[PDB]
Amino acid sequence: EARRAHEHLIRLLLEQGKCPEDGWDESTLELFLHELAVMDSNNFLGNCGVGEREGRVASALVARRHYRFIHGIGQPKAAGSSLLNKITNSLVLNVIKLAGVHSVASCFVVPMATGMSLTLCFLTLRHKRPKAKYIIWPRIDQKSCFKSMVTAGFEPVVIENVLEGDELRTDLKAVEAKIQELGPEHILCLHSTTACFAPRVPDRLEELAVICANYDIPHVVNNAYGLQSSKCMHLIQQGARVGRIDAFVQSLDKNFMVPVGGAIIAGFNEPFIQDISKMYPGRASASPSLDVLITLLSLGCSGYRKLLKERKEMFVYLSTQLKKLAEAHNERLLQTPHNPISLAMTLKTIDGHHDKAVTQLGSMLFTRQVSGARAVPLGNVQTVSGHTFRGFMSHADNYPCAYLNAAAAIGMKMQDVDLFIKRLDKCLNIVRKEQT
Amino acid sequence: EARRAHEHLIRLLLEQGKCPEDGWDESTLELFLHELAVMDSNNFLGNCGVGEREGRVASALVARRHYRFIHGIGQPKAAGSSLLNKITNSLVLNVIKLAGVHSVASCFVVPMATGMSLTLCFLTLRHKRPKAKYIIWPRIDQKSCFKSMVTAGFEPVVIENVLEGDELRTDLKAVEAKIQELGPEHILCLHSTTACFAPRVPDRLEELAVICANYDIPHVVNNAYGLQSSKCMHLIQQGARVGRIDAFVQSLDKNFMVPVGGAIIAGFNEPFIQDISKMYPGRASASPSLDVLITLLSLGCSGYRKLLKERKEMFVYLSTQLKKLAEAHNERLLQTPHNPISLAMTLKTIDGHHDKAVTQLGSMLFTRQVSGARAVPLGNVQTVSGHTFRGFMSHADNYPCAYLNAAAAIGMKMQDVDLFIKRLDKCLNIVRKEQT
Amino acid sequence: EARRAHEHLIRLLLEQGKCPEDGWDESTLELFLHELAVMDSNNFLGNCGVGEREGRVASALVARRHYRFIHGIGQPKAAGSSLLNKITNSLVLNVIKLAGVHSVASCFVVPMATGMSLTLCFLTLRHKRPKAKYIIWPRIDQKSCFKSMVTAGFEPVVIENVLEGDELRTDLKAVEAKIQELGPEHILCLHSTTACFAPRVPDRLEELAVICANYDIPHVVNNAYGLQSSKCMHLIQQGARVGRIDAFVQSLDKNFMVPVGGAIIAGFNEPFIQDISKMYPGRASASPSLDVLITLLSLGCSGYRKLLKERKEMFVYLSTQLKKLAEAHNERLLQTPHNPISLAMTLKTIDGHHDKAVTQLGSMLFTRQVSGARAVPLGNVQTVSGHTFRGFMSHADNYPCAYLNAAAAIGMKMQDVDLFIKRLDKCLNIVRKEQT
Amino acid sequence: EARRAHEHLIRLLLEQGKCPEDGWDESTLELFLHELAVMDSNNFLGNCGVGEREGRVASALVARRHYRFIHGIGQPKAAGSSLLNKITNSLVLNVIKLAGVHSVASCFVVPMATGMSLTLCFLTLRHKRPKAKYIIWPRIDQKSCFKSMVTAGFEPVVIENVLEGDELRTDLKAVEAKIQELGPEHILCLHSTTACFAPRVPDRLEELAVICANYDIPHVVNNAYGLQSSKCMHLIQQGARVGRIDAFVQSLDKNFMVPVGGAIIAGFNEPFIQDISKMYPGRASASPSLDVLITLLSLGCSGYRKLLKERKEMFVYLSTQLKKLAEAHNERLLQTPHNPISLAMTLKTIDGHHDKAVTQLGSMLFTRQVSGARAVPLGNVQTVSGHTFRGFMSHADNYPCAYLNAAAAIGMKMQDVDLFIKRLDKCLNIVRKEQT
C-alpha cells in the first residue's frame, strides 16, 4: 500500500529522530506536516476557544503559508507544534554530529538570529556569574556579534589580533594578560569566533579552551557560519576535548539556506544548555524551525552532505579563479590557508591615489549586481555601540593593504564565481584606466 | 486599465503609509508582494553572490511560502524587505492610533514574542540607568512577563494586589513605598500590565504614570493583549497625557490573529524608541512583519475596526451566557467591570471537598476540546525563576474563592461561547453528581 | 482525537457519497485530497514506470497546483483519480436532486464545456438512430449550442419563436409541423433550452416532452445555466414525469462558480447515460471534477442552498433597481415573468436615430468595466456555421424594439447591481445628451 | 533594475512568441502569470458583472490553484486568457519545429485528450467530404484511437499489419486495395499512427502520404506520443514533403510531462487547421494550456531539448538492460529497430503451460509497483465499440509469441529501468519455479 510506505518514513523519523538518508518526496513531507498541524488545538474540528491566545487566523494566506502552525513553540495547547520542535531539534543535533561535532550533547533552535542568540547565552551566564562584568573578545569587525555583548549589558574587552604573514590570528598572550589584569571572577566569558572574513581566520579554539578550563571561565563560540565547514567544526570538537567550550551558536540561514530569523545554540553540558533554553521567556515563532525541518527532510543526510562537499569544491574553484584574476591585474591572493570559507585579493594597484578607489570598486560591483563582496580600505574609523574601531572592516588598526573579500559559502554555484570574476575584471580595468 | 487600478492602491499605500479603508483583493496583495520581493538582491535575475549571507534557499517549499523574502529585516542587500519593514511599521502605528492611542510617536515590529520584547526594553534601559537593579511589578500570574525581568538581569519587586470587591487592583501605596525604600535611582522601571486574567484588572496606569513622572522613573507597560480593547488603549493614552509612559508592548498574535512570534514596541518619545530598536543586534525574521502586513492590507481599517466591534459584542454575549449558566448552577459571575476582555465565574459549589475538583474541571474541559479556560484553585504554590508564588494563578496570596476564567478576545465566534457553555454545563453536572 | 474527527467526515463522504450539510474546513479537505492523490501510482514511493503514460511531471508548479492528480479520469493505474471521479459524480447527482430534479437517475462530469457535451449527446444518438439527419431546435441566439449540432454532423432545423406579449416562446405547432414534414425517423432529437437571454424564456419542456414521447424522438435539453434555478429544474422534473426527456446538460462554471471547462450530462435512463459516457474515447482531464469537488465540499448543502436563495433575492433586487432606472429614463422593463434569471429593459429612447446608439451603449458599458450586459439592436444579420440569422442576438427576425440585457446569476452581489445601475444611468445620459 | 530584467524576458516572449533558450526563474514566471490574469475582466478591481458567465469563483483554493484564470479560452471578456492561448500555441508550434517538424504551418492546443482531438479532426472532415463513410486504419490495439472513429460516426476499416521479422508493419497493398474496393470518395481519411507498442512500429507515413496524395484522400496522423521522438517526427516531416498529411495530433501529457487532459492538433495547411479549430463549439478549459505554458517557460528550449536527449539515452540503457535480463532467462529482445520508444522481450519460457502465466506475470509486476509494463498473451479475443479483435493487445491475429512490453518515454530515470529489471527478474524466477 502506498500510504503505508509514507507512514513507514514518518514512523522512522519519529522513533529515531534522525535525518533520513535520502530526501523525502514533497508528497511525504506535506502529508506529515498536515498530520502534525492536525494535532494543534486551533485546528481541532470540535474545538471552542475561550482564551486570549487561541491561534485564530484572519487571513487564509497567512494560515496556509505556515501549514496551519499558529501557536508557535512552547495542557498542551499545541501538541503538533511541540512535536515539530522536538523533531527539528533532534534533526539539528544529528546534523551537528554529521558536520563535525560528534560529541555534542544538546542543542535547540531559537527563532532569533545569531546576535540575539549570543545575547541569550550571555544573559543566562549573568545568573551563573553575578560578579562578572567583562566579556573578553578577540576582534572581528562584524557589528552584530559585537553588539550582542552590549545588549546583554556587559562590557566587551576587545583583544587585537596578531598579524602572522597575511593572516590575523588570536592574540593568546593578550587574552591571558586581560584575564589576569581584570580577574577571572569579573570575566563573564570568553567570546571567540570561527568562520569570519579573510584575512582574519577562525580563533585558536583549542588554546582558548585550555585557557578557559584553567582560569575556570565560560567559553562561548560564535560559530555563526562555521557549521558548513568540517574544519571549523573539528576546531570546536577538538577544543571541547582538550579544554572548555560551554556553548557554540550558529546561524540557520548561513548554514542551511533558509530565511534569516533563527539560530542553533548547542553544547556539551546538557543541564547548562537547558538553562539557556529556560532563560528564554514565553512562546516563540515556529517558522525558523519549520523552514529547517522542511529543508533537512527534503535534502536528507545525503543531500546536506553533498551540499557540504560542493562548497569545498567551490572554494577550490573560487580561489583558483580569483588568484588567476588577481595575478592578471598584478595583484595577489592573500595567503590565508587557515580560513576554509573566506578569501581576499589585494587591491594595492588601485589604492594609494587618495581618490576613494577601493570604496568606489565596492559600489561598482554592487551596481553590477555582485553581492557579498567586501572592498576593505585602509583607515576606516567607525564607532559601534560605544567603541571606536580603527581600521574598521579589516579587524586590525594597521593591516598593511586594502583588499577585496569573496567567499565560498554553502549553495554557491559556478556561475556565482564566473560572473563575479567577469564583472570584477571589467571594474578593475575601468578604475585603472581612470587613474591612467 | 486593470493594472493601473492595482498600481493606484499600491502607490497610495507607499505615499501615505496607511491602512486602506477597504481591504485589498488578494490579487492586488500578491502583485504587491511579488513586486517587493523582486527588489531583494537574492531575487535579481542578473545577480551573483560571493558572500556568506546570500539568501540562497534550498527548498522551493520554503522560498514560495515566504513569497521569496529571505534576507530578513535590517548597500542595501534587501531593498524590498526593507520597504516591507517600513510599510508594516507605518501600518501598525496607524492601527495603534485607530485602536485608541492617538498620540503614539513611534513603534516597530520586533520578531520576538512579548516577553522577550519586554526584555529588550529592560536591556535598553540598563544603559540609561546604570545604577538600577530593581523592577517594580504589580503582580500578575503569567510566567513570561515575570521571567522577562529576570532574563534582562534585574530583580523583580513583586507588589501584591489590593482586593476591591471581587477585583484585584494596583496597590499604589505599596508601589510608592517600595520606590522610597529602595531609592528611585535603583529602580530600572515600573512594569505595569493592562489586559489580564479576571478577576485581576488592568493596572491603574494614570496614577502609576503620575508616580513615575514625579520620581523620574521609566514606565514600561505590558499591553500584551490590550490593543484589541479601546478601554485598555484609553488608559495608555490618558496615562501618557497626565504622566509618564516610556514604552508599551503588545503581542502580534493576540491582537492581529497571526502566528505567535512577534510583538510591537511603541512609545511617545521617538529617540527613545529608536534606542530600543538600535539595542537589537543583527538581522531579524521578516515573517511576523509579513503576516501582519498581509492581514492588515486584506482587512483594511474597516475590517480591523469591525473585528474590534465584534469583540465588544462577543464580550457582552459571553458574559450574559456565562452569568446565566453560573446562576443556574448556584454560582455567580464575579463583578469585574474594570476588565473589558476577561471574566470569571465562581466554582464554590465544587470546591472545598478536598478532592481536586477545580483542577479536575479544567482537565475535563480540556479533554472535551474546550481551550483557553482557566480553572483557578485556592492554594497553588509555584516557584517561577527564583520567586515562590502563593495562590499561583489567582494573582494574590488569599483570593476568597476558586473560579473559572473565560475571555472574549478578537476573532471569537458565537459557536465559541455556545459550545463552551454547553460543555461547561455538562461538566458541572458530572462533578456535582460525583460529589453527590 | 483530532484526526478521527477528520476521518469521520471523510468516511461519511465515502459511504453515502453525499454533500456534507455543513462545509468542510480546508484542513479536512486538503487532508482528503492528499490521501486520495497518494492512491495514484505516479505518487507511489516505491513505483517504477516503464510505459508511455506514467504521469511524470516536469514542473513542481504544475504538480502542486493540481494536488498531484496527474493521470486524469478513466489495473487501475489511477485509483485515487478514479475515486475522485466517483465521489464527484455522486456529489453532483445529489446537487441535481437538491436543485430540483429529484428523479434524476444518472449523471457524469465531462471535462468539455456545454457545447461539446451536447455534441457528445448527439454523437451517441447517431448510433441509436442511423436514419436520422435532423435536429429540431427552437431558436436561441447563442453560437455554441447552435454549433454543437453542426459539429456532431447533423443539420439544425431552426424553429422560430412565437411573440407572446414581450416574451419569445416555443412554437409548439411549428415543432410538430416539422416532425411530420421531415418524418420522425429522420429526426435525431429535439434540442430544447432552459435558461436563456430575456426576452426569450425557457422552452415549453412539458409540452415538448409530450410531443417527443408521442412521436418517439429523443429530447436533449440544453440546461447550460438552468441548474441554479429551481423553476428551470422543476420544468425538467415535470417534463420527465409527463413525457420524454433523454438527457439534460448543464455548465459547471455557470452553476458552480468554477473555471470554464466542464459540464454535467444527466438523465433518467441509466443505461442510456452510460452509453453517452462510453461513447467518449480515452482519458480526460480531472481538473473540472476537482474544482467542483473542492467547491461542493467547502460549501456543503447549506452553502450551495444559500447561494441559490441569494440569487433569487438578487434577481428581485436587480429587477426592482433596473425597472426604477428604466422608468426614470422613460424606458420600461420588458414583461418576462417566465424567465427567472435574465431580464431586459427597452432602449427605445436612444434607438431609431440611425447612429448605432444601441451598439455604442454596449461598448460604453464595456469600457466602464460593466461585463455581461447585452445591448441588442434591431436588425443584426449574422451567419453562424452555414445558417444566416436575421435579427441576431434577439432570437427572432422582427422583435419590436432594441433592449438591454442584465441577469442575476449565482454569486451576484449587491455591488454588481449598484455599480451597473450607476454606470448605466450615466451612459444613458451621455447618449441622450449627444442626440440632443 | 531588477524589475526591468523580468520585463525584458516577458517582452521577448510576447514579441517573438518563442521558447526562451534558458528556462525562466519561477519569480519571472509567476510575475508574468499574475500580470496576465490581471487582464481578465473577472479580476478587474472596478468590475461589475451582470451576465450569466462572469467567472465568479466560490472557492479560494480553486481560484488560486489556477492563478485566477477562470474564463477559459475563447469584447473580449478574457484578454489575458486569450493572450495565454496565443502565447501557448506559439510556443507549441516552435517546439514542434524543435522536435523535428520544421515545416509545420499551424497548430492549436485543444483541452481534450488525443482520442477526442482525433474525433474533432474527423468531425471537421465530415463537412469537407459529405459522401465519406469509412476511415481506413492500420491496426493498433489501443482503444481510444479506435473509438475516436466510431465516436465521430464513421466506420473503421481495420487493415491488418504485415509481419516482417519480429515487427508488425503497415500493409500498404491492403490499404490501397480497400481504397479501390470502397471508392476514394467514400473514404473520409486514412488514420495512421506513429509511436506505438512494440513489436508494432510507426506506420509507413511516406508511402501512405504518397497513396493519399494520389487518391486525393485526407491523411490524419495519430502522433499521440511521437513528438518526443525525432525519428517519429522526421517521418511526419518527410511524409509531408513527399506526399499528403492533413493533420497530426499529439498528447500533451505524454510528450510534455503534464496532467492528462489536452492535445495538440497541427498541420501544413493553415486554413484547414483553422477550420478544425472553428468546428469546436464554445469556450474550453485553459488548464492544459496553462500547464504546458508553465512547463515550457520553466524548461526553455535547452531544458526540453535535454529531456529529448536523455530519453534517447534511457532507451539505449533500457534495451541493453532488458536484453541482458531476457537472455539470462533464456528469452530474447524482439528485433524492433523501427520502434524508437517501445521494446518487447519474449515470454516463451513461461507461456504454453495453459496456466495463464503471461497474464499472471503482468499482475505480479503490478502488485510489485511496476507500472506501464504490458504482458501480452497469445489469443486475447476482445470486442471494442462493435469490432471484435483477435489477438487483442498484439496488433495481429496470430503473432508468434507472448512477450513483455517496456518503453523509454520522456522523463524516464535510471531507477525506473533498474527497479523494473530487479522486480522482473524476481517475478520470472517465481513463475518458473512454480512451473518447476
Q: Decide: helix, strand or coil at residue C31.
A: helix
Residue with cell 529482445: D333
Distance in angstroms (rounded) separating the CA atoms of residues C330 and B208: 71
Q: Residue B243 carries which DSSP code?
A: S
Bridge partners of B19? none
Q: How far is CA B97 from CA A201, B243, B266, D106, D354, in A?
A: 50, 19, 11, 62, 87
Q: Decide: helix, strand or coil at residue B5.
A: helix
* D87 touches D94 (CB < 8 A): no
- What residue type is C379 in one-letter code? G
Is any Cβ of chain C less than 8 angstroms from the Cβ of D411? yes
C241: number of Cβ within 10 Å: 12
Closest CA to C31 of D113, D60, D61: D61
Interstrand relation of D370-371 and D374-376 (parallel, antiparallel or unpaired) = unpaired
Provide the shortest C-alpha distance from residue D62 to chain B (in Å): 13
* A424 touches A395 (CB < 8 A): no
Nearest by CB to C56, from D71, D151, D257: name it. D257
| CATH number (domain holding residue D65) | 1.10.10.2160
Q: How far is CA A405 from CA A137, A324, A376, A423, B28, in A?
A: 23, 15, 8, 14, 41
Q: A250 and A134: one domain?
A: yes
| CATH number (domain holding residue A252) | 3.40.640.10
- What residue type is A272 in one-letter code? F
Q: D54 and D88: one domain?
A: no
B78: number of Cβ within 10 Å: 25
End-to-end CA distance of chain C: 74
Provide the shortest C-alpha distance from residue A403 to chain C (in Å): 43
- What residue type is C294 in one-letter code? I
* A170 touches A138 (CB < 8 A): yes
Q: Residue A384 carries which DSSP code?
A: E
Resolution in A: 2.2
Is any Cβ of chain A less than 8 angstroms from the Cβ of C11? no
**Interface B:D, Cβ pairs < 8 A:** 57
| CATH number (domain holding residue C308) | 3.90.1150.10
Is any Cβ of chain C less than 8 angstroms from the Cβ of A316? no
Distance in angstroms (rounded) separating the CA atoms of residues D292 and D284: 15
Provide the shortest C-alpha distance from residue B213 to chain A (in Å): 25
- What residue type is B246 in one-letter code? D
Q: B190 and B246: one domain?
A: yes
Q: With 0-12 CB in 10 A as exposed, 13-18 as middle and 19+ as buried, what is B277?
A: middle
C313: number of Cβ within 10 Å: 12
C348: number of Cβ within 10 Å: 16
Cα B47 to chain centroid distance, Å, stands at 41
Distance in angstroms (rounded) separating the CA atoms of residues C73 and D261: 9
The number of CA neighbours under 13 Å toward the Cβ of A221 is: 32
* B55 touches D39 (CB < 8 A): no
Residues belonging to the binding site of A for tRNA are 241, 368, 433
Q: How far is CA B403 from CA B107, B192, B197, B424, in A?
A: 37, 24, 11, 13
- What residue type is B429 in one-letter code? N
Cα A171 to chain centroid distance, Å, stands at 23
Provide the shortest C-alpha distance from residue C123 to chain A (in Å): 40
Q: Which three cell numbers stand for residue A213?
A: 578550563
Those residues with Cβ within 8 angstroms of residue C353's Cβ, 6 or more apart along the chain or in another chain: C435
> Do the Cβ atoms of A260 and B253 come within 8 Å?
no
For chain A, how many structural domains are there in total?
Answer: 3
Those residues with Cβ within 8 angstroms of residue D305's Cβ, 6 or more apart along the chain or in another chain: D98
Bridge partners of D388? D383
User: Which residues of A, range 110-169, sit inside 8 Å of B by Cβ?
Assistant: 111-116, 118-119, 123, 126-127, 143-145, 147-148, 150-153
Distance in angstroms (rounded) separating the CA atoms of residues B28 and C157: 49
On the question of a cis peptide bond just before residue A20, with omega within 30 degrees of 0, the verdict is no
End-to-end CA distance of chain D: 74
Provide the shortest C-alpha distance from residue A138 to chain C (in Å): 47
Q: Which three cell numbers stand for residue C183?
A: 418524418
- Dihedral angle of Cα A46, A48, A53, A58, to the nearest 10 degrees: 80
Distance in angstroms (rounded) separating the CA atoms of residues A290 and A36: 11
Q: D278 and D340: one domain?
A: no
Q: A176 and A90: one domain?
A: yes
Last residue of a domain, one of A260, A282, A299: A299
Closest CA to A404 of A436, A368, A372: A372
Q: Residue B125 carries which DSSP code?
A: H
Q: How far is CA A390 from CA A160, A380, A383, A387, A410, in A?
A: 11, 6, 9, 10, 31
D436: number of Cβ within 10 Å: 4
Distance in angstroms (rounded) separating the CA atoms of residues B371 and C26: 21
Q: A31 and A152: one domain?
A: no
* C190 touches C219 (CB < 8 A): yes
* H or E stretch covering C300: helix C287-328
Is any Cβ of chain C less than 8 angstroms from the Cβ of D194? no
Q: Residue A200 carries which DSSP code?
A: B
Distance in angstroms (rounded) separating the CA atoms of residues B191 and C227: 64
* D403 touches D167 (CB < 8 A): no
Nearest by CB to B48, from A56, A143, A420: name it. A420
* C322 touches C345 (CB < 8 A): yes
Those residues with Cβ within 8 angstroms of residue A81's Cβ, 6 or more apart along the chain or in another chain: A36, A40, A69, A71, A72, A73, A74, A286
> Do the Cβ atoms of C45 and A6 come within 8 Å?
yes
> Do the Cβ atoms of A52 and B261 come within 8 Å?
no
* A73 touches A285 (CB < 8 A): yes
- Measured N-to-C along each axis, helices D114-128 and D143-151 cross at an angle, to the nearest 10 degrees, of 30
Is D75 one of the annotated binding-site residues? Answer: yes
Measured in degrees and rounded to the nearest 5, phi and psi for residue C267 equal: -170, -175
Q: A323 and A289: one domain?
A: no
Closest-approach residue (CA) in chain D for B7:
D45
Domain that holds residue B386: 300-436
Q: After which residues is chain B broken (C to N over 2.5 A)?
A: 74
Distance in angstroms (rounded) separating the CA atoms of residues D164 and B365: 80
- Dihedral angle of Cα D176, D180, D184, D187, to the nearest 10 degrees: -70
End-to-end CA distance of chain A: 74
Closest CA to A108 of A304, A284, A236: A284
Distance in angstroms (rounded) separating the CA atoms of residues B296 and C391: 52
Q: Which three cell numbers stand for residue B416?
A: 465559541
* H or E stretch covering C325: helix C287-328
Distance in angstroms (rounded) separating the CA atoms of residues B385 and B148: 10
Nearest by CB to B38, from D3, D9, D68: name it. D3
Q: D262 and D410: one domain?
A: no
Method: X-ray
* B192 touches B205 (CB < 8 A): yes
What is the rounded radius of gyration, in angstroms, for the C-alpha atoms of chain A?
24
Q: How far is CA A12 from CA A9, A16, A17, D72, D407, in A?
A: 5, 6, 8, 45, 35
Last residue of a domain, one of C270, C299, C328: C299
Residue with cell 484578454: D79
* C41 touches C74 (CB < 8 A): no
What is the rounded radius of gyration, in angstroms, for the C-alpha atoms of chain C?
24
Neighbors of chain B with 3 or more C-beta pairs under 8 Å: A, D
Q: After which residues is chain A broken (C to N over 2.5 A)?
A: 74
- Dihedral angle of Cα C178, C183, C188, C191, to the nearest 10 degrees: 20
SS (H, E, C) chain D: CHHHHHHHHHHHHHHHCCCCCCCCCHHHHHHHHHHHHCCEHHHCCCCEECCCCCCCCCCHHHHHHCCCCCCCECCCCEHHHHHHHHHHHHHHHHHHHHHCCCCCCEEEEECCCHHHHHHHHHHHHHHHCCCCCEEEEECCCCHHHHHHHHHCCCEEEEECCEEECCEEECCHHHHHHHHHHHCHHHEEEEEEECCCCCCECCCCHHHHHHHHHHHCCCEEEECCCCCCCHHHHHHHHHHHHHCCCCEEEEEHHHHHCCCCCCEEEEECCHHHHHHHHHHCCCCECCHHHHHHHHHHHHHHHHHHHHHHHHHHHHHHHHHHHHHHHHHHCCCCECCCCCCCCEEEEECCCCCCCCCCHHHHHHHHHHHCCEECCEEECCCCEEEECCEEEECCCCCCCCCCCCEEEEECCCCCCHHHHHHHHHHHHHHHHHHHHHCC
Those residues with Cβ within 8 angstroms of residue D337's Cβ, 6 or more apart along the chain or in another chain: none
Q: B269 and B337: one domain?
A: no
Residues belonging to the binding site of A are 53, 75, 241, 283, 368, 433
Nearest by CB to A2, from C6, C43, C64: name it. C43
Q: D63 and D134: one domain?
A: no
Q: Residue C331 carries which DSSP code?
A: -
Q: Which three cell numbers stand for residue B102?
A: 492617538
Q: Decide: helix, strand or coil at residue C121.
A: helix
Distance in angstroms (rounded) separating the CA atoms of residues D352 and D357: 8
D317: number of Cβ within 10 Å: 17
Is any Cβ of chain C less than 8 angstroms from the Cβ of A39? yes
> Do the Cβ atoms of D35 and B9 come within 8 Å?
no
C436: number of Cβ within 10 Å: 4
On the question of a cis peptide bond just before residue B76, with omega within 30 degrees of 0, the verdict is yes
Is any Cβ of chain C less than 8 angstroms from the Cβ of A31? yes
- Strands (E) in A9-65, as ranges, are 48-49
* H or E stretch covering B97: helix B79-99
Measured in degrees and rounded to the nearest 5, phi and psi for residue B134 equal: -115, 145
Distance in angstroms (rounded) separating the CA atoms of residues C220 and D134: 28
Q: Residue A406 carries which DSSP code?
A: E
Distance in angstroms (rounded) separating the CA atoms of residues D102 and D95: 9
Measured in degrees and rounded to the nearest 5, phi and psi for residue D123 equal: -65, -35
Q: A305 and A281: one domain?
A: no
C335: number of Cβ within 10 Å: 12
Bridge partners of C169? C162
> Do the Cβ atoms of C281 and D151 come within 8 Å?
yes
- What residue type is B398 in one-letter code? N
Interstrand relation of B187-193 and B134-138 (parallel, antiparallel or unpaired) = parallel
Collect all residues of chain B within an 8 Å Cβ-Cβ radius of residue A84: none
Q: Is the dihedral of CA C149, C154, C155, C161 positive or negative?
A: negative
Last residue of a domain, one of B230, B264, B299: B299
Distance in angstroms (rounded) separating the CA atoms of residues B340 and A354: 67
User: What is the secondary structure of A238-252 as a DSSP string?
Assistant: HHHHHS---EEEEEH
Collect all residues of chain D within an 8 Å Cβ-Cβ radius of residue B6: 38, 45
Measured in degrees and rounded to the nearest 5, phi and psi for residue A73 equal: -100, 150
Neighbors of chain A with 3 or more C-beta pairs under 8 Å: B, C
Cα B418 to chain centroid distance, Å, stands at 26
Residues belonging to the binding site of B for substrate are 75, 283
Q: Which three cell numbers stand for residue D205?
A: 507515413
* A395 touches A170 (CB < 8 A): no
Those residues with Cβ within 8 angstroms of residue B423's Cβ, 6 or more apart along the chain or in another chain: A48, B365, B368, B369, B370
User: Which residues of C, range 48-77, sit inside 8 Å of A by Cβ?
Assistant: 60, 64, 68
Closest-approach residue (CA) in chain A for C68:
A27
> Do the Cβ atoms of D43 and B2 come within 8 Å?
yes
Nearest by CB to C59, from D54, D295, D369: name it. D295
* H or E stretch covering A167: strand A167-169
- Dihedral angle of Cα A251, A253, A258, A263, to the nearest 10 degrees: 20
* B246 touches B128 (CB < 8 A): no
Is any Cβ of chain B less than 8 angstroms from the Cβ of A343? no
Is any Cβ of chain B less than 8 angstroms from the Cβ of A285? yes
Distance in angstroms (rounded) separating the CA atoms of residues A355 and A436: 13
Distance in angstroms (rounded) separating the CA atoms of residues D114 and D226: 12
* H or E stretch covering C288: helix C287-328
Q: C48 and C139: one domain?
A: no
Those residues with Cβ within 8 angstroms of residue A320's Cβ, 6 or more apart along the chain or in another chain: none
Provide the shortest C-alpha distance from residue B41 to chain D (in Å): 8
Closest-approach residue (CA) in chain C for D142:
C282
